Amino acid sequence: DSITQKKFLCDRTLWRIPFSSNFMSMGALTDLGQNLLYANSAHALDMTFEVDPMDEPTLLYVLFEVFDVVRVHQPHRGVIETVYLRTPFSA
């Protein structure tokens, strides 16, 4: 008499949850990312992860996807000015 066990493996990738109203990619700047609800006011965020136990210390690696940009300006010989902007989660 037997018992069946099912599982899966999914190495070298990252679990993703896009902040898109339909989870689809319709542009870098997502539609929800442009919603006035997340622009005109601040919000707190709570996340709860349930994971399989491991008999050793581990780390939850969360990637908050944002825009990490820079604009470079070279007005005169030997001059470099940079404007960095990262949002949300600005420096």
Partner 1 sequence: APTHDVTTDRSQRLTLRFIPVDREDTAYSYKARFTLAVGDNRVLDMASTYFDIRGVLDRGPTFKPYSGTAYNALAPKGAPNSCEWEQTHVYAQAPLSGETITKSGLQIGPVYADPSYQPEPQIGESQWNEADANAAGGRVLKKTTPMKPCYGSYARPTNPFGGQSVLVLPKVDLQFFSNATKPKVVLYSEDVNMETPDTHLSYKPGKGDENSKAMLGQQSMPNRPNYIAFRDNFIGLMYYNSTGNMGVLAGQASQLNAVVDLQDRNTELSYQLLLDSIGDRTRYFSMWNQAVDSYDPDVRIIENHGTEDELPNYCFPLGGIGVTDTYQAIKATTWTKDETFATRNEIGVGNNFAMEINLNANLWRNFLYSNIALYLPDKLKYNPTNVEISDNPNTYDYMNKRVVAPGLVDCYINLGARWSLDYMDNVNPFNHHRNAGLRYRSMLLGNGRYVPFHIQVPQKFFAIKNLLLLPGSYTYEWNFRKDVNMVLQSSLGNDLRVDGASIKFDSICLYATFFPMAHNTASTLEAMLRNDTNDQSFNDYLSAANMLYPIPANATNVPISIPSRNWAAFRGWAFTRLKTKETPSLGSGYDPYYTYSGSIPYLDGTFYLNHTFKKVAITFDSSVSWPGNDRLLTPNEFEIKRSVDGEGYNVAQCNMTKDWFLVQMLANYNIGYQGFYIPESYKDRMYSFFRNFQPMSRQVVD
Binders of partner 1 among residues 10 to 29 (CB under 8 A) are 10-25, 28-29
87 strand-pairing partners: 67
In angstroms, give the least distance from the CB of 81 to partner 1: 7
In angstroms, give the least distance from the CB of 62 to partner 1: 5
Q: Would you say the C-alpha torsion 10, 14, 19, 25 has a positive or negative sign?
A: negative
**DSSP 3-state of 70:** strand
**Is there a contact between 90 and 69 (Cβ–Cβ < 8 Å)?**
no
69 binds partner 1 (CB under 8 A): yes
31 binds partner 1 (CB under 8 A): no
- 32-51 mask for partner 1 (x: CB under 8 A)? xxx---xx--xxxxxxxxxx
